[PDB]
């Protein structure tokens, strides 16, 4: 006799993480379900889980973490006024915590799925969800949203940022700010924070000079957005009746924040104020104040996100810029939330499998393969490329060339190998995380939102399990071997590539095009079929049937380095350049100059002795360099144009002591540091972090005698490759920048 | 319009000791937006660098902090 309802779960958040009595190595966690029934009406629900120590150490990847540490972190996060920003101590701890609580939720209660129909039960005697089941009836309500804008001037003292950056050098400045709030929470009490959440029913806007103080401008009310709900619960951990206050999000479902100037400290401060306001009255339990994002780690992260691990229980999606297709990225964020249960991108690679169950699956996948690939996996050394390719100083043409790619081969191969090791998993029900990856791979061609997930879930998974790299690159090595074997039969000739993407030539007469399409299509058919046959023979089965993409037909192709290739189809003048670093806005203009110079220099096929062509080519390359440096002068004062994106891994210029004064601008720095080298006074070249100063900027003249030298360096690399690849070798194209056209800037 | 006879002068005239202080004071209003801090040759080098810096669109030039006019 269990109650039964019909609802869709819109979010799953963490309320309490406690250690029951007579307990040493298992902690209970209460989960808040934001359920909404048909037509949008929302009733709040709760469930309980029980995570053991072993599961925690599995999702952490190490035994350093303990149940006591997790419970202490949760207790610290119980109060945001005393100490917010709890995850910043051990971000991996909270990452693993959310991973295991979601896994236990899936295991004990049953299958859960956001924004999807779900039959839900409850036990009144205790008062929590007991079992969740996938339903098959109902046109569920649309996942409504609310647009949030929040800006705060948290008066952080610059010297503290400088000191904390001195302790850890390559600390992304958002982490420096966030650590400053963490070490002095009173700073989050005084800030000119402004908030404007617009919904489809009623708007809400508030303005503060000091956060704790009453607003200096009101609009709507807190009650229009929130329906504060007091729910009684009797967990197995708590025998006494425990009451919980939750902020049911009426009208909307999730938040949509612009990622252009998103400040994680701003939302942290606003949510801390809301937490204090709602849980000020006692007689009820307090929730977990936990948030994660790329700003929460020293070295930062690629993809902007803002996790909501606890209070208020509403997912908030940062959609960076992309104004033209704002709806597209909002839908992509919503789909990423719904599919991977909202763990992505906060939990990390643990959405699929625990970081420590992978060492078993990889071993269990090295056994079900064929005998040859079994060794091929074991002999994989970084960048082996055991396949007949071209010497990197070389070029081809005029012959019919073609580029091919298998869309999402690493992700599809990882999915097949995960299934091969699936039998080796401890729990058959613990393979639901292995159902999200297949959902991603299946929906990858249909919708690009799965794409960006798979281009980051896979490389990060390969870092979670180092042993998976030698497996994936062995399977791909086997794929390349059969590509080469089948190539000879269809006149295709492997000339270069990087595995899933490969470009080659055809031994057809280089003048006929009517039959060219036929051979170019038969080669695709045969290579695709043969690779699929090898994969099937290797037992690895792909969910989405394999497909080869004809990414372009070209007549000339020139390669200089291992990644640098330029293709050009003379008939339609369609070209493609790869391997040129786009490390700024000037490198794009350099790439365009290179792709025009190469188009003009391979148009010199007029009958001539090879020696003549080398000189009439070098002259044109020098002229192209001239026209580039001439146009460089007309943009000498655009410092943002002469900017380079330094990674937190690369060696970086030292931060000026005045860049620590950007206010609500230091938060934007999550991954890249955009630096411009200016030349104050004389002789000395100093770096300016462009995005840490207010605009319009005032600077000494930009040292174009440094950036143009590097741009020219890579241009001469490409030009030396083409000069020594089409005609006779022996010529390193150098442009005398220091003499011919140095005067313009220095 | 810098070497065209004008009814009055417009610029920064002070002894090395005073202009040293005024250059630092100008940098205090110049540092907030990009100019690095320079913590009778240094003064001439800094003044020459300030004079050489060009106008970016309609925005007043960098030396306008010292000369104190938007028509510079």
Curated annotation (Swiss-Prot), chain A:
GO terms for cellular component: host cell nucleus. One of its GO terms (biological process) is bidirectional double-stranded viral DNA replication. Pfam families: Herpes_HEPA. Keywords: DNA replication, Host nucleus. It is found in: Host nucleus. It comes from the Viruses. The keyword Cytoplasm does not apply. Changing residue 608 to G: In strain: Nonneuroinvasive mutant HF10. Its main location: host cell. The keyword Lyase does not apply. InterPro entries: HSV_HEPA (IPR004996). Associates with the primase and the helicase to form the helicase-primase complex. Interacts with the origin-binding protein. Interacts with the polymerase catalytic subunit. Belongs to the herpesviridae HEPA family. Component of the helicase/primase complex. Unwinds the DNA at the replication forks and generates single-stranded DNA for both leading and lagging strand synthesis. The primase synthesizes short RNA primers on the lagging strand that the polymerase presumably elongates using dNTPs. The primase-associated factor has no known catalytic activity in the complex and may serve to facilitate the formation of the replisome by directly interacting with the origin-binding protein and the polymerase. This is DNA helicase/primase complex-associated protein. It comes from Human herpesvirus 1 (strain 17) (HHV-1).
